[PDB]
């Protein structure tokens, strides 16, 4: 609404024209990227959670398994082709409303491949249009053994009534927010679950996960 | 325009600032492309052959060896640094005169290095301004034993009377189209030749190639 | 007054949006850079000195150690993580102190890593806001044994009163200019020093460097 369609499309042509005509802009943006990675990589961890509370716990684009109004919320960084995530996600859903004032926030990651980014792109695109339709797709993207492809996924989005949903480019923005966050939180292992100022890197026994979520509910008010 | 030079002047400045101030935009586009590569890589070669018919056969930026109006048209994805292409390219030119109803469209590829991109950038730039000078340059770049540099390329140019010719950035657009089409068609080797309804991957003995294309001249008779 | 603030942000959204919806714009721009890089590597060394004299000697963004009034100007491509530059940089302040008609322009390079690029970005940012404080930071980053970190750089700024200065993105253009310039000049070792029409690559004994710069003070 700031720019008109005629203005808006000329700008889109200029982006292409400028980067190719002046490639020096690109290498500058490359070194600037490799630098910002280091700025986040060599940061202080706890103060990341105090400064990243709004992106972790208050992202409207981040899928949630459980109640939207809960006192304790877990954040699970996951990959749909990672065997350990497939082994832990069920443990994360069972704690949801066996312990009802606890919910789980999903942060999909593109670590193990292109399908990981692709599967994430599907899951995030679904979350905005029909949030309740997320779960069925989420479980089968997880419970499907082997590295999914666009073909394996076209079967998955179809066993969940989510095939009319288009993978948006804006859903890719969120996947990135999750990716920068893993670095800011210093996570290069998945699964990773944030449960209140602390991170859980790896698969943990249910009865231990059980104790942890209870200890963090003691950490809250009355 | 739509935009005035001053506005146009700011847009070129903002793209630099945007990419440098927010470098994460870049890595987002990096995986988005690795994603897009795979979507083209995992495309169906038939519906790739069917949907890329105008891109293969009706690109004015793609050089043609043979008759302008021919019914059988071969599309050769080539690289000027490929040892096999140098020995296969003459064989494709022999068919264009033994069989006047056959033409060959050159689809240069930048697989084997940066010089390949530069050499491709040259022939495509020449073809757009003066098509008649292309073949001489094409052959001198191709039939050149050993790797290419800007000097070896520049030696082949006025030695074909063509260094007055500018290497345009729009020729990169065509090289790029050649690059994406190669992925949609499932091409993991140069040379690669489109021969009707299937692709011929590799350097082939002439008499093997001969039977193949007359077999393709039988399917259009007239 | 070309674009309004609302327009300036939509343009920022469109550049972001356009590159992601059409990632192919990027890949075309990737090999335009890889091509441009090779074009610089395959330049003739001397005609690179002749064609970018304006970039070497007349960049207001390039720090200078010595007199604004000098007849001879040295251009030293250096790295704050290169041990040879740490042994050569002190020798460069002596000639500017031995010979007041000689000056030194610093051309930082991010060759040995990301730490090199950040450290350069810190030093260049100071030069733009507080030129007088540059030398102190420059010297303290140099005499630092071992590689630098985000902490090590920031500590050297606190030890020189330059921590209040922000690392600008405008310094990356300069950092980038030095990198393309290093390629055109065919520099694959630091230190590298432009001394009129020749480059002297490496840490050299003072008495060798002295004879050279006096000999070129004879040619001017």
| A106: β partners | A76
In a domain, C7, yes or no: no
A151–B42 CB contact, under 8 Å: yes
Among chain C residues, CA nearest to B174:
C28
d(CA B182, CA B200): 13
C98 three-class SS: helix
Among chain A residues, CA nearest to B33:
A114
Return left, alpha or beta for B61; rule: phi > 0 is left, psi -120 to 50 is alpha, else beta.
alpha
Place of tokens 């890197």: A201
Total Cβ atoms within 10 A of residue B152: 15
CATH number at residue A118: 3.40.30.10
Chain B residues within 8 A of C23 when measuring between CB atoms: 29-30, 32-33, 35-36
Cβ contacts of residue C149 below 8 Å, gap of 6+?
Answer: A42, C115
Total Cβ atoms within 10 A of residue A129: 13
Chain A residues within 8 A of B38 when measuring between CB atoms: 114-115, 118, 150
* Model resolution, angstroms: 2.6
Return the HEC string of chain A.
CCCCHHHHHHHHHHHHHHHHHCCHHHHHHHHHHHHHHHHHHCCCCHHHHHHCHHHHHCCCCCCEECCCCCCEEEEEEECCCCHHHHHHHHHHHHHECCECCEEEEEEECCCCCHHHHHHHHHHHHHHHHCHHHHHHHHHHHHHCCCCCCHHHHHHHCCCCCCCCCCCCCHHHHHHHHHHHHHHHCCCCCCCEEECCCCEEECCCCHHHHHHHHHHCCCCCCC
Distances (CA, A) of C194 to A205, C75, C105: 65, 5, 10
Cβ contacts of residue A71 below 8 Å, gap of 6+?
Answer: A101, A102, A217, A220, A221
Domain of A165?
Answer: 43-222
d(CA A159, CA A152): 11
Supply φ then ψ for residue C136, to 5 degrees.
-60, -45
| Among candidates A2, A12, A27 on the partner chain, residue whose Cβ is nearest the Cβ of C18 | A12
In a domain, B186, yes or no: yes
C7 three-class SS: helix
d(CA C116, CA C110): 5
In a domain, C175, yes or no: yes
Supply φ then ψ for residue A136, to 5 degrees.
-60, -40
End-to-end CA, chain C: 46
What does chain A come to in residues?
222
In a domain, B10, yes or no: no
Rounded to the nearest angstrom, the minimum Cα separation between B40 and chain C is 12
Among chain C residues, CA nearest to A11:
C11
DSSP state of B164: T
In a domain, B151, yes or no: yes
In a domain, A112, yes or no: yes
What the block records as the tokens of C87 is 């042994």
Residues A61, A127 contacting (CB under 8 angstroms): yes
Q: What is the CA radius of gyration of chain C?
A: 19
Rounded to the nearest angstrom, the minimum Cα separation between A31 and chain C is 8
In a domain, C182, yes or no: yes
A29–B11 CB contact, under 8 Å: no
Rounded to the nearest angstrom, the minimum Cα separation between C203 and chain B is 33
Method by which this entry was solved: X-ray
B2–A10 CB contact, under 8 Å: yes
In a domain, B157, yes or no: yes
Among chain B residues, CA nearest to A18:
B12
C117–A31 CB contact, under 8 Å: yes
What is the domain count for chain C?
Answer: 1
Q: What is the CA radius of gyration of chain B?
A: 19
What the block records as the tokens of A148 is 């999914």
B3–A18 CB contact, under 8 Å: no
Q: Nearest Cα to B163, choosing from B153, B173, B177?
A: B153
Cβ contacts of residue B86 below 8 Å, gap of 6+?
Answer: B142, B143, B144, B145
Rounded to the nearest 10 degrees, the angle between the axes of helix A5-21 and helix B5-21 is: 60
């Amino acid at each position: 609404a700031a720019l008109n369609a005629a203005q808006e499309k000329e700008v889109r042509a200029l982006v292409r024209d400028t980067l190719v005509s002046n490639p020096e802009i690109l290498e500058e943006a490359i070194m600037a990227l490799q630098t910002k990675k280091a700025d986040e990589q060599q940061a202080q961890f706890r103060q990341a959670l105090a400064s990243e509370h709004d992106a972790l716990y208050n992202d409207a684009a981040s899928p949630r398994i459980g109640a939207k109004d809960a006192k304790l919320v877990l954040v699970s960084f996951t990959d749909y082709n990672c065997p350990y995530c497939k082994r832990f996600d069920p443990l994360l859903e069972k704690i949801t409303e066996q312990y009802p004032d606890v919910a789980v926030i999903i942060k999909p990651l593109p670590f193990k491949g292109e399908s990981s980014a692709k599967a994430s792109q599907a899951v995030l695109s679904v979350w905005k249009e029909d949030p309740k339709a997320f779960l069925a797709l989420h479980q089968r993207l997880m419970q499907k053994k082997t590295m999914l492809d666009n073909a394996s996924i076209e079967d998955a989005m179809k066993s969940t009534n989510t095939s009319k949903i288009k993978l948006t480019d804006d859903s890719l923005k969120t996947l990135q927010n999750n990716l920068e966050l893993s670095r800011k939180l210093g996570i290069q292992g998945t699964p990773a679950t944030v449960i209140g100022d602390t991170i859980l890197p790896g698969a943990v026994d249910y009865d231990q996960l059980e104790i942890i979520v209870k200890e963090q509910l003691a950490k809250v008010k009355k």
